[PDB]
Each structure stands twice: as structure tokens, then as C-alpha cells.
Design an enzyme around this catalytic site. Structure first.
Site, PDB file in Angstrom:
ATOM      1  N   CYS A  46       0.878  -1.198   0.000  1.00  0.00           N
ATOM      2  CA  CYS A  46       0.000   0.000   0.000  1.00  0.00           C
ATOM      3  C   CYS A  46       0.915   1.248   0.000  1.00  0.00           C
ATOM      4  O   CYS A  46       2.036   1.249   0.532  1.00  0.00           O
ATOM      5  CB  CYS A  46      -0.928  -0.003   1.220  1.00  0.00           C
ATOM      6  SG  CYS A  46      -1.914   1.487   1.490  1.00  0.00           S
ATOM      7  N   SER A  48       0.644   3.737   1.742  1.00  0.00           N
ATOM      8  CA  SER A  48       0.900   4.183   3.123  1.00  0.00           C
ATOM      9  C   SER A  48       2.192   3.551   3.623  1.00  0.00           C
ATOM     10  O   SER A  48       2.867   4.158   4.435  1.00  0.00           O
ATOM     11  CB  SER A  48      -0.226   3.881   4.050  1.00  0.00           C
ATOM     12  OG  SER A  48      -1.411   4.523   3.648  1.00  0.00           O
ATOM     13  N   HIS A  51       4.877   5.662   2.415  1.00  0.00           N
ATOM     14  CA  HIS A  51       4.961   6.937   3.183  1.00  0.00           C
ATOM     15  C   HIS A  51       5.913   6.776   4.378  1.00  0.00           C
ATOM     16  O   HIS A  51       6.520   7.788   4.793  1.00  0.00           O
ATOM     17  CB  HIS A  51       3.583   7.412   3.695  1.00  0.00           C
ATOM     18  CG  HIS A  51       2.637   7.840   2.627  1.00  0.00           C
ATOM     19  ND1 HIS A  51       3.032   8.236   1.377  1.00  0.00           N
ATOM     20  CD2 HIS A  51       1.283   7.935   2.656  1.00  0.00           C
ATOM     21  CE1 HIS A  51       1.972   8.648   0.684  1.00  0.00           C
ATOM     22  NE2 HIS A  51       0.872   8.441   1.454  1.00  0.00           N
ATOM     23  N   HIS A  67       0.780  -3.533   6.533  1.00  0.00           N
ATOM     24  CA  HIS A  67      -0.540  -3.465   7.225  1.00  0.00           C
ATOM     25  C   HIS A  67      -1.665  -4.079   6.435  1.00  0.00           C
ATOM     26  O   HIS A  67      -2.800  -4.041   6.953  1.00  0.00           O
ATOM     27  CB  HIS A  67      -0.894  -2.027   7.609  1.00  0.00           C
ATOM     28  CG  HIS A  67      -1.064  -1.119   6.439  1.00  0.00           C
ATOM     29  ND1 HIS A  67      -0.011  -0.716   5.692  1.00  0.00           N
ATOM     30  CD2 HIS A  67      -2.182  -0.687   5.812  1.00  0.00           C
ATOM     31  CE1 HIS A  67      -0.482   0.052   4.683  1.00  0.00           C
ATOM     32  NE2 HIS A  67      -1.837   0.048   4.704  1.00  0.00           N
ATOM     33  N   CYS A 174      -6.927  -3.390   3.609  1.00  0.00           N
ATOM     34  CA  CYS A 174      -6.722  -1.941   3.501  1.00  0.00           C
ATOM     35  C   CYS A 174      -7.315  -1.400   2.211  1.00  0.00           C
ATOM     36  O   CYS A 174      -8.365  -0.761   2.290  1.00  0.00           O
ATOM     37  CB  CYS A 174      -5.248  -1.522   3.634  1.00  0.00           C
ATOM     38  SG  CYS A 174      -5.215   0.276   3.524  1.00  0.00           S
TER      39      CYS A 174
HETATM   40  N1  LIG Z   1      -7.764   6.709   4.570  1.00  0.00           N
HETATM   41  C1  LIG Z   1      -7.298   5.472   4.587  1.00  0.00           C
HETATM   42  O1  LIG Z   1      -7.687   4.660   5.437  1.00  0.00           O
HETATM   43  C2  LIG Z   1      -6.251   5.110   3.629  1.00  0.00           C
HETATM   44  C3  LIG Z   1      -6.140   3.747   3.229  1.00  0.00           C
HETATM   45  C4  LIG Z   1      -5.267   3.357   2.191  1.00  0.00           C
HETATM   46  C5  LIG Z   1      -4.590   4.336   1.560  1.00  0.00           C
HETATM   47  N2  LIG Z   1      -4.603   5.666   1.953  1.00  0.00           N
HETATM   48  C6  LIG Z   1      -3.902   6.732   1.237  1.00  0.00           C
HETATM   49  O2  LIG Z   1      -4.561   6.818  -0.044  1.00  0.00           O
HETATM   50  C7  LIG Z   1      -3.609   7.316  -0.994  1.00  0.00           C
HETATM   51  C8  LIG Z   1      -3.651   6.448  -2.229  1.00  0.00           C
HETATM   52  O3  LIG Z   1      -3.088   5.172  -1.901  1.00  0.00           O
HETATM   53  P1  LIG Z   1      -2.851   4.161  -3.153  1.00  0.00           P
HETATM   54  O4  LIG Z   1      -4.040   4.097  -4.036  1.00  0.00           O
HETATM   55  O5  LIG Z   1      -2.282   2.919  -2.544  1.00  0.00           O
HETATM   56  O6  LIG Z   1      -1.698   4.972  -3.879  1.00  0.00           O
HETATM   57  P2  LIG Z   1      -1.131   5.023  -5.338  1.00  0.00           P
HETATM   58  O7  LIG Z   1      -1.252   3.664  -5.960  1.00  0.00           O
HETATM   59  O8  LIG Z   1       0.175   5.736  -5.302  1.00  0.00           O
HETATM   60  O9  LIG Z   1      -2.175   5.952  -6.181  1.00  0.00           O
HETATM   61  C9  LIG Z   1      -2.056   7.380  -6.134  1.00  0.00           C
HETATM   62  C10 LIG Z   1      -2.389   7.887  -7.517  1.00  0.00           C
HETATM   63  O10 LIG Z   1      -2.383   9.320  -7.485  1.00  0.00           O
HETATM   64  C11 LIG Z   1      -1.871   9.774  -8.690  1.00  0.00           C
HETATM   65  N3  LIG Z   1      -1.413  11.171  -8.539  1.00  0.00           N
HETATM   66  C12 LIG Z   1      -0.274  11.630  -7.960  1.00  0.00           C
HETATM   67  N4  LIG Z   1      -0.258  12.939  -7.969  1.00  0.00           N
HETATM   68  C13 LIG Z   1      -1.440  13.333  -8.585  1.00  0.00           C
HETATM   69  C14 LIG Z   1      -2.013  14.612  -8.957  1.00  0.00           C
HETATM   70  N5  LIG Z   1      -1.331  15.706  -8.630  1.00  0.00           N
HETATM   71  N6  LIG Z   1      -3.132  14.643  -9.513  1.00  0.00           N
HETATM   72  C15 LIG Z   1      -3.857  13.559  -9.794  1.00  0.00           C
HETATM   73  N7  LIG Z   1      -3.332  12.312  -9.552  1.00  0.00           N
HETATM   74  C16 LIG Z   1      -2.140  12.257  -8.911  1.00  0.00           C
HETATM   75  C17 LIG Z   1      -0.740   8.824  -9.082  1.00  0.00           C
HETATM   76  O11 LIG Z   1      -0.422   8.880 -10.469  1.00  0.00           O
HETATM   77  C18 LIG Z   1      -1.404   7.487  -8.622  1.00  0.00           C
HETATM   78  O12 LIG Z   1      -1.989   6.733  -9.655  1.00  0.00           O
HETATM   79  C19 LIG Z   1      -2.257   7.356  -0.222  1.00  0.00           C
HETATM   80  O13 LIG Z   1      -2.008   8.700   0.266  1.00  0.00           O
HETATM   81  C20 LIG Z   1      -2.461   6.423   0.917  1.00  0.00           C
HETATM   82  O14 LIG Z   1      -1.559   6.633   1.989  1.00  0.00           O
HETATM   83  C21 LIG Z   1      -5.495   5.960   2.980  1.00  0.00           C
HETATM   84  O1  LIG Z   2      -3.235   2.850   4.285  1.00  0.00           O
HETATM   85  C1  LIG Z   2      -3.782   3.028   5.602  1.00  0.00           C
HETATM   86  C2  LIG Z   2      -3.144   4.063   6.486  1.00  0.00           C
HETATM   87  C3  LIG Z   2      -3.733   5.260   6.812  1.00  0.00           C
HETATM   88  F1  LIG Z   2      -4.933   5.631   6.293  1.00  0.00           F
HETATM   89  C4  LIG Z   2      -3.126   6.156   7.558  1.00  0.00           C
HETATM   90  F2  LIG Z   2      -3.707   7.309   7.897  1.00  0.00           F
HETATM   91  C5  LIG Z   2      -1.955   5.837   8.136  1.00  0.00           C
HETATM   92  F3  LIG Z   2      -1.347   6.725   8.956  1.00  0.00           F
HETATM   93  C6  LIG Z   2      -1.313   4.715   7.839  1.00  0.00           C
HETATM   94  F4  LIG Z   2      -0.132   4.426   8.429  1.00  0.00           F
HETATM   95  C7  LIG Z   2      -1.937   3.806   7.088  1.00  0.00           C
HETATM   96  F5  LIG Z   2      -1.301   2.631   6.833  1.00  0.00           F
HETATM   97 ZN   LIG Z   3      -3.094   1.085   3.458  1.00  0.00          ZN
END
Ligand SMILES: NC(=O)c1ccc[n+]([C@@H]2O[C@H](COP(=O)([O-])OP(=O)([O-])OC[C@H]3O[C@@H](n4cnc5c(N)[nH+]cnc54)[C@H](O)[C@@H]3O)[C@@H](O)[C@H]2O)c1
Ligand SMILES: OCc1c(F)c(F)c(F)c(F)c1F
Ligand SMILES: [Zn+2]
Ligand SMILES: NC(=O)c1ccc[n+]([C@@H]2O[C@H](COP(=O)([O-])OP(=O)([O-])OC[C@H]3O[C@@H](n4cnc5c(N)[nH+]cnc54)[C@H](O)[C@@H]3O)[C@@H](O)[C@H]2O)c1
Ligand SMILES: OCc1c(F)c(F)c(F)c(F)c1F
Ligand SMILES: [Zn+2]
Ligand SMILES: [Zn+2]
Ligand SMILES: [Zn+2]
Lengths: 374, 374
Positions: A46, A48, A51, A67, A174
């Protein structure tokens, strides 16, 4: 038998930020009271987790990250009632203690026992079950899935269908559940609506899935990487737009496309600028925007509160709003019953030993989800 | 006899920011097609009117302000079907055209014909009905109630009960309906919940009335003027706090007092800092915060989006989320039936000619609502 004994196993240890994972031997203590030791079967990569490597997310190092996983219970500590040795399980990065004000609330899921807000990188009892080269190693979100064996508190594990394919259902831990629930549960997308999804990675594709399942008439995918568009359309996007193709800011494009703003927008990237863009592009009087992307540590956004005074709703959620221990088994059961698909999210399957190569696929833009198999 | 003729009457003209109103003769043109000319009976002084004087709210000058009023139809233009001469009416600062995408939406109220987002200070047709010293004078929000006579578009007026006491029900034109609806409709306050209300003026007292009507168990009023606390308790506050009494920031104080955050918070002041403080003090996983106060023109707030990612909902609204023309007559009917009280908001009564004294009372902190009688 390993029960009651220290296990020496392989894990991916992150010793410092912006370095590759170190695949090496760790010792895994046996579970204490109300703890569960799990043999991992599959784990996703993921964003995250990336990150933590990049420093976007701060958590104590050194650490065993990971995770998004599934595995099989190897042993249980005294007092565990909800899982037994041999059970398929999903570690829950958001716990469900069942006792706190949030767990008791009908719409709450961010249990106060979580290790996200103010991360300690331990078990609930404030100690670690991991050592490596004689040094204690931190846990991550009470899960730590980049290891052949982990130890989790009972409130951070769910029992799932014994017939579950763990190489697919690990995405319910996730990225699928987060995106799907963000659309169906947090936004409550309506039949006939227009949605905009910013970011077409694993989580954004799962938001599209949810928007389509909720009956949205239009689902506009937004990404700067046009290579992401074909799979977004396969799972339900009606249009895709790349901001880099336009002279105008994309909020203006999307407001024009939707004849005055979208019903629902989602930020699924993790940028402050796109959080504000996504809010702006929803209709000013009755639009809803949901933040899903994890922002960079300690950075504030700037916005004009008139965007909200007109009538917009802005919300965010962890894990799609789902109460984790109640929801994960039901989601696996729904998958088993062909209610949704996970294969569209899986682009690569690698052995665990190729974790670094998995992260390089994510960082390069090639992958959606790589699943690592132990 | 005045039908189809220019009317010469007194109005309060604002020629310049940060100056007293000038009570002087204006010429009020007869209504054009789908316009209504109204003899005003009573108008409240709302802090938004003062915002026009201070420059907090930017609208074209010179202007006839005033938006919280009631009066009697003098004449109707061609094609008017919804009011007649001699009807009691409330001008609607938020119109209801009944035809736009917002008017058609079940939860929308911010009609696209409004003059709030990008104020022109005109009638719908882009012209003015007011002359003073031979110069055109701006309208305000399509109402302009600081005049013995005004002209409004049909979509900006509601017919109300012929037995209405206009010197009371004028408060349904803004402050009461805004605060009450912000609680009952926008936030959807629940039985047994804890609410925090920032700002205990006429609008925030109306929020308290709505929170109490909805069954909240605890209503914490927040004001830096402790003289505001006795009336807040009379209308339902269970306790009041003055940020100036505390060493710690009030979001921390309210989180402690509520054992982890409030269910519902309301910003009813108009400050960027209190909008953030109000969001922060609602419970991080399921709390809701509503912006009611009008922010200073063109200024952005700064906030950490983690406040939302955990689960908070942030929203704002104009006029309590009420569809104005549908809702105003019903609210008047409910007041007639004693379903809510308006007298607690009325602290002073003055003749229209003493408008400037009415603004002095608001600025000194003495008044809640001054009602001016024509
Ligand atoms: N809230 C939650 O519980 C939770 C859960 C899982 C992931 N996340 C977050 O969700 C986000 C996406 O995760 P993911 O899908 O695994 O990531 P990912 O696979 O990197 O997808 C992100 C996408 O955003 C695109 N992108 C980057 N910059 C831009 C821009 N400026 N404009 C438009 N598109 C852009 C990029 O090309 C990519 O396809 C991350 O920040 C994670 O940390 C949060
Ligand atoms: O992808 C899920 C995820 C989150 F949404 C967070 F906010 C975070 F801090 C993190 F560590 C995490 F794994
Ligand atoms: Zn995640
Ligand atoms: N959204 C809408 O439709 C709508 C309608 C009506 C009024 N408004 C706005 O709502 C706000 C309140 O209007 P009102 O009740 O007539 O005004 P008011 O009578 O000026 O009440 C504001 C209250 O805020 C208090 N106050 C000022 N600063 C602080 C502080 N730092 N912390 C705590 N309390 C503070 C102050 O003492 C006063 O009692 C104004 O900004 C209006 O423009 C919005
Ligand atoms: O008090 C109601 C009110 C508002 F809520 C505004 F947002 C606004 F711009 C204004 F002029 C006004 F009068
Ligand atoms: Zn809990
Ligand atoms: Zn309309
Ligand atoms: Zn007002």
C-alpha cells in the site's frame, strides 16, 4: 511445535527512512495474554507503507511495516476467545476494542486504541514482540505484516472464511475496503449521481468500484498518469482526465464537465492541493468531498471557508468508515459470494523476498497492488 | 394610487464603508415584470449588515442594506402569481427560483440566482430600482430592507400568514431561521448529544434553541463576552465558557469537558481561528462541525487535514439550510402555534430613524436583536 516458544523467522526490517527494506532474521516472542501470533500468507504493498519509507508518515523506527495482509493463526495467548490456531485471519490496522466511545457509536470506526494518531509502534501493553540483531524493533499500526510471523492484539485481528483465498482477500485489509467504503458508507454515493475520483491507484480504483455499485451515472477519474486510465474505465470510470492536458485548473474543468459541480468527489492521492481542488469541484450547495489520501506529516492546507458556507460537506475517513472487526469477515464473505472483484487491483504477484522490487514497481507508476507471498 | 408610480420615501443609504447610515429621501421605481414592491413594517439589525459597513462583507456601494425584515405588498409587476397587494411578506435574502439544479435537489438551498457569492447589488435584471440625489443606489442580497419601500424579485419574497406579528416574525427572515436550521437541519443534532456553540448573539442563541429542540443533553455556549451567558442559559445552554478565563486553548478545554470531544459544534461568529477551533473540538472520529459565521472577505484559513481524515465532518450553510420560499411561511405558521419563541432574541426596539443607535447597540455588545419599526 512453535507454541510458547520464540520463533526465528524472516522479516523486512526498515532501519531508517529512505533506505531499502533489510530482509533478515528476527525473533518473534510468543503471544502474551489477549495476543495472537500469525503465520503470514500474503501481504499487499500500500502507498501508506511507502509513506513510512519516504518520511511522509512519521512512526518510530526501526520498524516492521506492512498493514495489508492475511495469514493463519499459529498460537493464541491466554484469554483469546475470537480466533484459534489454524484460523485464517486478517490483521486490522484500525482496531475494534468494542468498549470505547467510538466503538459504541453507530458511525464511529476510528477506535481510541488505534496506533495511528500518536504512534508508539508497540503492542497495546507498550512493549515489542520483535528483536533483530539484539535490538528491539517497533510494530506498525498493531499489525507489522512484512514478517513471516507477527503478533497482534486480539482487538486487531478478525477471523475470516476458512476457504478464503488469502492471496486475494488480503486487499480487504486496507486498499479495497478503504476505497469501497469511502464511496458506499462515508460519502453515501447516490443512484444517478456524478462522482470525481482524484488518484487512480488501488484505493482510487476501489472508490470507483464503490461509486459504480452505488449506481453513480458518471464517474470521472483524475490522474496525472494516463497509463492509469484503461483500468479505471474497466472498473467503472465513464471519463478520465489528466490535469496536465488543460490550461485551466482541473476544479474549473470538472465544474464545467458536470454543469456546475459534481455530487461527490474523493481525494485519493495525499496532496494538500488536490484536497482543496477536490472540495472545490463538488457542487457548492450540496456537494460532498471525502479525503482518503494520507497528508504529509504536520503540513496545513489553506482554503477559503466560503467553500463550506454555501453548503458543501467535507469529511475524511480511515478504512472506508468500516468498524474493522465487524466488517472484515462480512467483506470476505461478500467476496466469496461474488459481490465484488479484487483481481482488477492485482497487477503483480512476487515472493516476499522481492519486497524492494515491489516498492520500486509502486514508485515507478507501473503497479496497482503487488501481492507478496510468503 | 401609488401603483405604477415612483415612490419618494426615506431609506438608510450607506455611501461609504465605516460611516454612519444616511437617513434621506430615495426614489423607488415601480415593479417591473415578476417584481414586487413592499412597504416595510419592521427590520432587524443582523451582524451581516454591520459586516457591509466594516468591509468584512464586500458588496457594491453605495447601497441600501438590510435583509431581515417583513412588510406588506404595495404593488406587483406583470406576471406575479405568488403574492398580491396587501399580503404580509418576508423578503428572502436567499432566493428560491424553483428551477435551478439546487432548488430541485432535496438538500440544496443556495439557489443559483443568489446575489451572495459574487455580489452585483442589483435586481435579477442587472439594474437598480433606487435613486438618491439623482444617483443609482445598489441593492443588497436582492432585499434592501433599510427603506420604507423596497422592490424585490418574486423569487425573493414569501407570502406569510395575514395574522402575523411582523415586528416579531422579521427574525424568521435571517437570524432565527439560520441558527435553528443550522442545528436541526444542517447538523441534525441528536437526542442526548453534546453540542458546543461559539458565539452567543442572535444567531448562536437560535442554534441553542435548535439544539435544545432536538434533545441535546449538553449545550456548551462559548463567548468572550460573559454578559451573553445569562440569555444563553435561558434558551437552553447547560453551561457557558469564556476562552479568556483559560490558560489552554478552548478546543482542549471543550475536549476535556466532553470526555473526548463534542458531538456537534457550531461557529457562529465569523472568525477563521474559531472555525478551526470549532472543528477541532468535535470528536475526531464522528464529530460534526457547522460553519455559520461569515468569514472576512477573501481570507483563507489554515488547517491540518488530519482533523478530517480521522472521521470529522465539516460543513457550512446559508439560512439554516432552509429552502427559503417553501420554509419561511411554515416557520411563521409554527411561530403562530407557539412551536418556538422569538422574544428572547429581541432586546431593543427603535424607530427606523434611530438605525445608527441600533448599530451602536450591536457594536457595544449590549444588544442581541434590535427591531426597527417604520
Ligand atoms: N484513509 C485510509 O484509510 C487510507 C487507506 C489506504 C490508503 N490511503 C492513502 O490513499 C492514498 C492512495 O493510496 P494508493 O491508491 O495505494 O496509492 P497510489 O497507488 O500511489 O495511487 C495514487 C495515484 O495518485 C496519482 N497522482 C499523484 N499525484 C497526482 C495529482 N497531482 N493529480 C492527480 N493524480 C495524482 C498517481 O499517479 C497514482 O496513480 C495514499 O495517500 C495512501 O496513503 C489511505
Ligand atoms: O493505508 C492506511 C493508512 C492510513 F490511512 C493512515 F492514515 C496511516 F497513517 C497509515 F499508516 C496507514 F497505513
Ligand atoms: Zn493502506
Ligand atoms: N450563514 C448564514 O446564513 C448567516 C446568517 C446570519 C448571520 N450569519 C453570520 O453569523 C455571525 C453571527 O451573527 P450574529 O449572531 O448576528 O452576531 P453577533 O450578535 O455579533 O454575535 C457574535 C458573538 O460572537 C462573540 N465573539 C466574538 N468574538 C469571539 C471569540 N473570539 N470567541 C467567542 N465568541 C466571540 C461576540 O461576543 C458575540 O456575542 C456573523 O458572522 C453573521 O454575519 C450567517
Ligand atoms: O446574515 C446573512 C448573510 C450571510 F449569511 C452571508 F453569507 C452574507 F454574505 C450576507 F450578506 C448575509 F446577509
Ligand atoms: Zn474502541
Ligand atoms: Zn434556484
Ligand atoms: Zn443575517
Amino acid at each position: 511445535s512453535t507454541a510458547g516458544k520464540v520463533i526465528k523467522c524472516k522479516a523486512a526490517v526498515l532501519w531508517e527512512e529512505k533506505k531499502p527494506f533489510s530482509i533478515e532474521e528476527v525473533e518473534v516472542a510468543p503471544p502474551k495474554a489477549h495476543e495472537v501470533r500469525i503465520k503470514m500468507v500474503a501481504t499487499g504493498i500500500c502507498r501508506s507503507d511507502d509513506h513510512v519509507v519516504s518520511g511522509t508518515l512519521v512512526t518510530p523506527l526501526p520498524v516492521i511495516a506492512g498493514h495489508e495482509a492475511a495469514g493463519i493463526v499459529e498460537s493464541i495467548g491466554e484469554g483469546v476467545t475470537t480466533v484459534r490456531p489454524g484460523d485464517k485471519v486478517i490483521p486490522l490496522f484500525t482496531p475494534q476494542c468494542g468498549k470505547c466511545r467510538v466503538c459504541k457509536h453507530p458511525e464511529g470506526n476510528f477506535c481510541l486504541k488505534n496506533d495511528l494518531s500518536m504512534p508508539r509502534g508497540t503492542m497495546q501493553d507498550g512493549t515489542s514482540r520483535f528483536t533483530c540483531r539484539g535490538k528491539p524493533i517497533h510494530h506498525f499500526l498493531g499489525t507489522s505484516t512484512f514478517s513471516q510471523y507477527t503478533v497482534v492484539d486480539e482487538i486487531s485481528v478478525a477471523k475470516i472464511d476458512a476457504a478464503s483465498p488469502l492471496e486475494k482477500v488480503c486487499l480487504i485489509a486496507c486498499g479495497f475496503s478503504t476505497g469501497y467504503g469511502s464511496a458506499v458508507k462515508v460519502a453515501k454515493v447516490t443512484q444517478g449521481s456524478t462522482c470525481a475520483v482524484f488518484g487512480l491507484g488501488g484505493v482510487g480504483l476501489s472508490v470507483i468500484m464503490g461509486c459504480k455499485a452505488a449506481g453513480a451515472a458518471r464517474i470521472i477519474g483524475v490522474d496525472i498518469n494516463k497509463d492509469k486510465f484503461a483500468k479505471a474505465k474497466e472498473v467503472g470510470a465513464t471519463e478520465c482526465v489528466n490535469p496536465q492536458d488543460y490550461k485551466k485548473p482541473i476544479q474549473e474543468v470538472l465544474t464545467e464537465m458536470s454543469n456546475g459541480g459534481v455530487d461527490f468527489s474523493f481525494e485519493v492521492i495525499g496532496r494538500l492541493d488536490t484536497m482543496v481542488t477536490a472540495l472545490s469541484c463538488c457542487q457548492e450547495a450540496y456537494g460532498v468531498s471525502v479525503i482518503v489520501g494520507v497528508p504529509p506529516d504536520s503540513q496545513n492546507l489553506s482554503m477559503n471557508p466560503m467553500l463550506l458556507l454555501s453548503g458543501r460537506t467535507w469529511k475524511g475517513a480511515i478504512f472506508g468508515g468500516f468498524k474493522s472487526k465487524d466488517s472484515v469477515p462480512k467483506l470476505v464473505a461478500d467476496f466469496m459470494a461474488k459481490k465484488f472483484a479484487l483481481d482488477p487491483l492485482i497487477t503483480h504477484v512476487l515472493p516476499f523476498e522481492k519486497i524492494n522490487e515491489g516498492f520500486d514497481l509502486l514508485r515507478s507508476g507501473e503497479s496497482i497492488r503487488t501481492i507478496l507471498t510468503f
